[PDB]
Paper text:
CD38 is a 46-kDa membrane glycoprotein with a short 20-aa N-terminal sequence, a single transmembrane segment and a 256-aa catalytic carboxyl domain. Decades of research documents that it is a novel multifunctional molecule, serving not only as a differentiation antigen on cell surface, but also, most surprisingly, as the dominant signaling enzyme responsible for the metabolism of two intracellular calcium messenger molecules, cyclic ADP-ribose (cADPR) and nicotinic acid adenine dinucleotide phosphate (NAADP) (reviewed in Lee1). It is well-established that the C-terminal domain possesses all the catalytic activities of the enzyme. In this study, we have generated a series of nanobodies targeting three different epitopes on CD38, definitively identified by crystallography.
The purified recombinant protein was used as an antigen to immunize llamas. Phage display technology was used to obtain 19 positive clones against CD38. The crystal structures of seven different nanobodies complexed with CD38 were solved. Three separate epitopes are identified and are colored differently (orange, cyan or green). Two of them (orange and green) are located close to C-terminal region of CD38. An additional epitopic region (cyan) is distinct, which is located close to the middle of the molecule. Consistent with the long distance between the epitopes and the catalytic pocket, none of these nanobodies shows any antagonistic effect on the enzymatic activity of CD38 (data are not shown). CD38 and nanobodies were mixed at equal molar ratio and diluted to 20 mg/ml. The diffraction data were collected at 100 K at BL17U at the Shanghai Synchrotron Radiation Facility and processed with HKL200047.
Author numbering:
A (entry chain B): 1 to 128
B (entry chain A): 49 to 245, 250 to 292, 296
Write the structure that this text describes.
Amino acid sequence: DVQLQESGGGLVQAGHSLRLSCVGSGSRFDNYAMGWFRQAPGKEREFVAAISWSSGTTRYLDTVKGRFTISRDNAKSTVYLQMNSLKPEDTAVYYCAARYQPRYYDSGDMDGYEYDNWGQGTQVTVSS
Amino acid sequence: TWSGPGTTKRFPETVLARCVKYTEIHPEMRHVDCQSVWDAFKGAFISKHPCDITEEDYQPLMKLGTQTVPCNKILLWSRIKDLAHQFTQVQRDMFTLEDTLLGYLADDLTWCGEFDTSKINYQSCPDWRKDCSNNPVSVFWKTVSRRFAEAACDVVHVMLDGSRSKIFDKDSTFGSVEVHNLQPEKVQTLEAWVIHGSRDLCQDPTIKELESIISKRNIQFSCKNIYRPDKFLQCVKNPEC
């Protein structure tokens, strides 16, 4: 079980950048596949990006490819979401999530993860 | 007919799929061409008498499978495979030999070929004790474990089984190969983790023999009891116990 804490949200202009961070504590960070999700107001939570423990495998929502990059630093128990070329439709609370992953995972299983550890979220507002 | 079991069913397919899986997991190894790795592996022992294999036969494989492991994160083990791999399953910045690409590809498999043909021998393979020690499997493990031990630096760790009649055994891979291939330049200290299955075991006669070997090679020796293995793995998983 891992405790997650996001930060780095904010108010930014359309076209600009923000870098989100999420620090984990409790169980070893390098045992977890990490995911970023987001929920806009009055809409349903959606998947944004994910990364394996080893950074060997990433997955992205189609509409964020070539704009957002997921990465991590296991020694700092931290996962990052670098969000470039932000659009008004990127406005949302961004949530960090974790899912236990074996050291020797099948990359196929990266598509079917139900994430069971969640942070409280960081607010991102993009204006224009 | 040899005395040992034949090559593992689906050896080629199993090695190739292990290579694909490992190189997907590890971004530093995604350059590796898994077909070439297999060709090099197969080239070490195909069309060869399986009592005539040498470290040279495996050189092309070592070149393709070479890997930089952080030299201060190495875990050696002797007769306690189970718990060693459970440890590195959690403590993922650390590597046993079977956590390296080449070690991962070969773990729990047997293989050999034959002099007459280009075919894999699925019928039988030489047993190291009853047939010959220079067989494809033993020579593979001797080569990769020497290189792994030569790569180590700073504090090297070794897990040992405290429930055995000889906690340290001179006649094991650890006791006859790895221990003589740690380099005094690179390696300051060998730290033994004695796993209990309870009183301090670091004065056991065999541990004193290990200490003697290590000291004679100008490396420092240190010994620690793991009195309760469960608690140990739990505490590595969540340090905040």
